[PDB]
Design a binder for this molecule. Sequence first.
Ligand SMILES: [Mn+2]
Lengths: 402, 404, 402, 404
Amino acid sequence: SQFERAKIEYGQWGIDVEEALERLKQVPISIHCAQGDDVGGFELSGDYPGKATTPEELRMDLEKALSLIPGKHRVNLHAIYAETDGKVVERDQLEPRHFEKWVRWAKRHGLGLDFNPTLFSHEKAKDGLTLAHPDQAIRQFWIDHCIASRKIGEYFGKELETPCLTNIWIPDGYKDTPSDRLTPRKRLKESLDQIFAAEINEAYNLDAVESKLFGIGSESYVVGSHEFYLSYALKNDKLCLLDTGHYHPTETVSNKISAMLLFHDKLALHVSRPVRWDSDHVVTFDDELREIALEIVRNDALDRVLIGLDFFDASINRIAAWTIGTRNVIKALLFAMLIPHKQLKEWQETGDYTRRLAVLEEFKTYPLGAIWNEYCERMNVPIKEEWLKEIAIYEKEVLLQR
Amino acid sequence: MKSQFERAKIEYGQWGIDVEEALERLKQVPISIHCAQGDDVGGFELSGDYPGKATTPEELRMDLEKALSLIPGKHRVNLHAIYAETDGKVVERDQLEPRHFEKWVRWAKRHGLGLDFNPTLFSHEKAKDGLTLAHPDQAIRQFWIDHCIASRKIGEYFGKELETPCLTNIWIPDGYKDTPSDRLTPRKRLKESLDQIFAAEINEAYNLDAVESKLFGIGSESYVVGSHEFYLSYALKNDKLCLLDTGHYHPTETVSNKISAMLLFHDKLALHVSRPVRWDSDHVVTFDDELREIALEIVRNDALDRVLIGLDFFDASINRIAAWTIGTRNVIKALLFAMLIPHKQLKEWQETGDYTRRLAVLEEFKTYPLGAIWNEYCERMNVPIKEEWLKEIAIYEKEVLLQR
Amino acid sequence: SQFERAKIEYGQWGIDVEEALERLKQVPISIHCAQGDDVGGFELSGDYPGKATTPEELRMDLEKALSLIPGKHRVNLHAIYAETDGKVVERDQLEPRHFEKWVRWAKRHGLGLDFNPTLFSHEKAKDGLTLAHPDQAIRQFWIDHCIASRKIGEYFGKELETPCLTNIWIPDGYKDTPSDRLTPRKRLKESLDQIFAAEINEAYNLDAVESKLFGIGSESYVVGSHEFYLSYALKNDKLCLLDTGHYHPTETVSNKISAMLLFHDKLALHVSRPVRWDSDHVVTFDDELREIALEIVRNDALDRVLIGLDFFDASINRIAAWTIGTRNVIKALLFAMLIPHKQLKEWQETGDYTRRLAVLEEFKTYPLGAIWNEYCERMNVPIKEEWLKEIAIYEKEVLLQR
Amino acid sequence: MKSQFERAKIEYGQWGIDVEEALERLKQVPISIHCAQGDDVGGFELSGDYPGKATTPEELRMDLEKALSLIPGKHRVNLHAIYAETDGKVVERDQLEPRHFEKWVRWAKRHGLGLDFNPTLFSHEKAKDGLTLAHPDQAIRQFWIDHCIASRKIGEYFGKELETPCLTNIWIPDGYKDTPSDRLTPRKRLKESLDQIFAAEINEAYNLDAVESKLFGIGSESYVVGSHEFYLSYALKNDKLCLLDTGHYHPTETVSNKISAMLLFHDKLALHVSRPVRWDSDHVVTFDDELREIALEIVRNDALDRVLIGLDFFDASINRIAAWTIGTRNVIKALLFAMLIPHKQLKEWQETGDYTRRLAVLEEFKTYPLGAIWNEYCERMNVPIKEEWLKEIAIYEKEVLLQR
Ligand SMILES: [Mn+2]
């Protein structure tokens, strides 16, 4: 009845809530694994306690998170989460077999997997240059790692019968002012053209490139910038990936979505909260998230934007992290599904800016919670703060064994 | 629908949150609505947008009543010196006296309204250089000094008449388009000028003084005389109020963060809320992240009587009554939202280091049935309930607005 | 002597200053006409005194300034600068013959001409949409108008024997939050496709598109975003023009030149001084300005980056404005010419981040004035502040009498 | 070589600028070099980067003398509490005394340097919650209070011995990573802790106390207890100095605009210049627009004795002696540039409305022969001519920094 009352209110505007709920149920969010062991990894190498120690602990943790999150979703894996045996394999030598257990586990749970080559925390990545390193030998090693990484995506997609997105992000740049911006960039372009040389069926693997404005130790210059990647990706029929953390002060991904859809057709984004740097805070139901959802739903792009999460806070419960974050992007999608686009578009189309504002503003007090809650039941997940209870139980008996 | 309110009351009461208490408290927080919005900053001195602006004081007060109709609770009007009511008789700004705002006081009194006041230091001959209380020539400074001193008198006059104090705010355009060659002298001049304005004491039961900083405005982008650090220091040293403008700061600088620091040393602040979009653009206020953050500071620091909330936007691309009612209702919605947060629990989770619960519940509380509360609140208070206000605006626009 | 002493100091690094001056003599700088009459123009339908009012007054004003700016340059014209007879001709109906006095004059002074359709201050631009207005009859008007403009662009290149660049800039956006970001941009794209339908020889005309992030009344959203134009230009083999005042706080055009040049080949620019909004302050010899220049020089892009000026300061002497803004940008090119790029490239390549910083910093005190003053002597323009005298004269006798 | 200077001295002469005067005052102004840069914020408490970092007090002092070899003029060294010399002894921070800095004071005296001081409220067991003076735990609060008092005492000691006052600046890292649910009570506690630190009366002839705001740190991204607005109000009420750091501000935010407003209310003023690149990233100070604007401000406003200038930077990735010398020589160049600007004529033009000349000459001055003047100055002061100091750093790194 609570629900039922909410349903009518949306009804008056022609919003079909059941339809919205039915399409929402479908959309997959790709959850990053890094959150669970604090970017550790199993590659032979103070904060909130009981992070995962092993892939077995790591997988357990995801299932728990996943069981608190409505819908059916995906795990975004990194090259360093390889299960070599006890045998240490160098990164340019990674192969599908290194990911059997991951894949087998994903299939059992009916999940999709996404991949990323890992281009940091490594002997050959300490100069802060990787694909753009002045040393041929270093570039190859990294080129080979990415090529390897692409085949692993291909393995994933074949197996999971849903295309893997393999995304390249590199830490490349310099700390202080560079005396030359162009040539590293030329080295990066050449390196990529190599990485992407062999074709793979777009049914199994998709390729993305990710820019960053600045990082720690790359304050002043980043090789693979926005304009760089936007252009590169455009020439070579690849996907851009946009991180809500990697741009200028005041700069929004929401504003970029619709321009990008006119020329690209598929588009990847990682949502994370910047708090004044690519800080990787847990995603929150804020204005920019709402504006991103709005843009996604309105531009009829629920199958063209591959939503991924990217965030790392070690100060708080790692399961709560995943679940807060993921539950936020879904709520946001939902809110954007429950909005009168047609009346709103036709009002801006005809100059009535007055009601466009009034109504965008009024829907902020409509009963999202009554639909949000109903949805959570229908989807077998705890309904409000109830989900904290499961975390508490879980942390006690297992999270706090190790 | 009464059930909707009732179920929500249970949902909130489960936290210790008393929605009846919160609504009572909300009832009496006054918002000061700026008049600059009715007539496109036009005023009534000797001196192709959106149609049907206000054109006489009779039109601006009708307009104001009309918006006040649609806004819940009981409020204040923020007047500017250029909305002075002379006859058809030019009186210079330094010659301004209570008599020139008698019609307004009486109107406010009848409708049970507070009046705040503002000297006007833009759009005038002795402002044409873009310097004012800090102009190089004595006679220009002395003029704007006499004008501000006049405006303090008028504010004292409102306080006396309306038996609720009037904040007289001082904002000046002074600055330079391009890089300056001296940043001090003009500030020295501002200081000396303000010292002269605040010389005569006025009872604080009638009139409080504010000073408003700006980072930049157009024509005035390289440097502004009345800077943030300047007026922070001045108000402290001289026991005056800072007025803070949500629109008058750096990229990403938020006032929400400033309130706590300032309540520790000042005991009363003023705010002007407006929406900047990339500059002091003066957009209608929205229920957004920052407006809720401001509200949380006000409520949770128990500064509901310490923070004088006023609005300050000018949208002449949309209907002006609607402008008023959206903005004003948005801030009330925010205060409400802040009144329905489990502060005690949140504060305690912080002191304890339980950042998991703090974020989880802050976040959770963003889908609680705020609307059900708001709707009921709107109805006890005789305003249209959701979109409905938009229907009276449609009528008023044809009915009166557009025979004008 | 002074110059000969300076010369030796740069000569110690392998820096031939004689050669730098030789190449500096040949770089054109495209000066905007807007600055002369405060964007008035000659269409039938407070600030500092002495502003131009007539075609005749504006040509004298450009000549004055050109005569205080060393070298040979071009003038950048807008469509509202058409000289109909006393006739009145609609913007879609403008023809080469409406600019033939302009051409004759530049032939007479050895100047290139650049072009711009004007899509603002007009009835058919008053809803703030233009190439993207919902009304097809509005769009077509503007489509034709830009087409007319390209034809004029062709005229200049033919007549003057130097390609003309015809840059499109539109004011299109909304002040307040759009309820649709997608459908306005789809329309820009279709308008531009139509505009660029006819091919024109690259030796006579080039096209460029110019992004912007916001304007006044254009605050919340702007159709011609940076992502739209970069994508469009790349797909359609057109030039991107970048305006230093047209981006996010802390966002730098300098950082973009290097990547742009990897994919375009030809790049267009406008140098403005943003002061907290797109405000059009005279360009000053600043860090970003220097940085831009370095980037243009190291990258071997003097022929590849088309340097235009765009600013409008009505608060000072207008002839002063032009001469301060141009000499500055020349100045910066000079500065970058007198940089030990190869020793600096190497140290970067090599990891000697210490020398790099050290010497880039050390060059900020090198004897540029000496060189800059020599250059102005050889180029028959006044040498330090003495061009001010010539302004004071021109102001007394000519300007203050209109 | 001495005529290059001569020809240059004349060009400046024409504007009635006295270049001899300029250098004779430039010689006087002390810069305060931070010790952190020499050993990578190591310290000597009992607890991938460029090699040869300093590892002991003798080594760090030797390092320091090396950098002053190459920096013209006479200076000061900004010490941190953790650089205490306890023999083999292990003394806690609240237990720190003037004897634990005797070597330092003996050394600075022989080389004729002033010494500034900072307590250290990070890298400690009792600062792991990211809270310090604002921790909820009174004992922890007490502990740091105790430690701060201690360092005011040690600074006093510095003033007496070196016959010039020591600035003891307080910077704390207190804040939260994620959105807080209370911005006020944590600042209530800092206020209170500061009141205690400062209750112990200490002679200003010998020690001055400063307080340092930061906007965000990694791990304190959402909120810092030390608001700019908090310290700015604090220092004014309690007669202390604000210390301004060029990296602890909002994007586009400048210290150079804050100087004039501050000097007007404060008398004395400290700053740390560091290069921020998109965060308090502590890069080596470069001769840039903002460094140029700060120096103009200090010079024009007659403040060479009202602005205490310290360096604060740590770039672990270049030669650390180079870092000190590039940086210090830059602020000095900047000062020097500001000394060679026709302030009077420029001031007159602003006053007068001639923004045309104001802009034209400030720019024209950017190509005047600063290098000619700066070279002579360098020679006169017995430091390496130009780049030539890179030669002395290579000689030092080879036969010294790398016998480690
Ligand atoms: Mn990322």
